[PDB]
Amino acid sequence: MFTLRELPFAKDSMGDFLSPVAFDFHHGKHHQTYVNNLNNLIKGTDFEKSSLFAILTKSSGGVFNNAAQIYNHDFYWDCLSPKATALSDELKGALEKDFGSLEKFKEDFIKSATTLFGSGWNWAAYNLDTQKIEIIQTSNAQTPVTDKKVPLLVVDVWEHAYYIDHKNARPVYLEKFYGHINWHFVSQCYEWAKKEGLGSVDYYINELVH
Amino acid sequence: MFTLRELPFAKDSMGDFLSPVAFDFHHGKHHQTYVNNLNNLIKGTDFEKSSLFAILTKSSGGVFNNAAQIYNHDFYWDCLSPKATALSDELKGALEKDFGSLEKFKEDFIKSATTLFGSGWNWAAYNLDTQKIEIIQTSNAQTPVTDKKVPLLVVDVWEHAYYIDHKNARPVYLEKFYGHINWHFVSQCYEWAKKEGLGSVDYYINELVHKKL
Ligand SMILES: [Fe+3]
Ligand SMILES: [Fe+3]
């Protein structure tokens, strides 16, 4: 049984992007609800004492939906920062190699998050076999982790993530999101994806959050 | 070449269920956008001069997403009424038969609409082979029509359909929706589903909603 993580920044620290109320609802209610739903669903089952990483990579159905949503949001929050941070030279190099330039990566990342139809998530994930960074869009609760890929960056595109401050204007929301990307954290994720592979995710969930 | 349908009621007629602003965005922007997207996507293609029913039942990809979303919303708007209207004796009989009672149908319909995960629609559709009314949930833009079934009632559960007035409280939104069901329209759909089958859908789209001028 898990507990909702603390937001890694103050609710009023990103006024050009999300408002305190947006956070109250997204984190305080939606995220909270996924935590409570998982706890209630695993009670008396094979996962009642399993780690989130365990449940995430092994479960399915509702248990998965909730487990994954808890992970996706936790990851999403860490991808955000009040103030801009710099990219590690390795991440920068990797992005320019796999995308041509940082500007092209942005363009590709945003366009992909713009066209994702219905509820979902838009990721930048490290492929272990290809050793390349891919821009992947997943629907509803899915996450690249179940495809053996390591999340480096993600933006929530479920409408509840931006309707309060932006209504239907997802593009504006995306542009504001990009400006607040916690490159420092994206850099960490990359470095460890290369060193521990999918194991870095395990560590993240268990040693960095839950 | 399509144009956004007129809302079948006043934007301020839906009490605490849907507010005028909610309508400005849902109909005025989301629905409007699917119309504009489809028009732009078919320009210069095989579907350029096709009817919505045609495109809806034959296309796929983005063309389908937009085509279906146009239909789904059109249908959704007609399922709403400033005040709940009456059920035809046939529809009532049919619902009691396939669900036990109206109250049980409500219970089942609402529960199915409540658990549908992610974006989607919650329908009550007539099965032509079984001649039974089924409660079906579809994801994103899908609609029973592609499974040869006739929509009788639907509720939009994409979050944009209720976030403005209800935020995350889909259940409250669903309970309010139910109180505004245009049974008169649901009855029409049923009668014609039995008489013209999937053809009633064709007529609905081409003849009474998107009649070119
Ligand atoms: Fe979310
Ligand atoms: Fe809608």
TrEMBL record, chain A:
Destroys superoxide anion radicals which are normally produced within the cells and which are toxic to biological systems. Destroys radicals which are normally produced within the cells and which are toxic to biological systems. PROSITE patterns: SOD_MN. Keywords: Iron, Metal-binding, Oxidoreductase. Mn(2+) binds at H26, H73, D156, H160. Its cofactor is Fe cation. The gene is sod. This is Superoxide dismutase. Belongs to the iron/manganese superoxide dismutase family. It comes from the Bacteria.
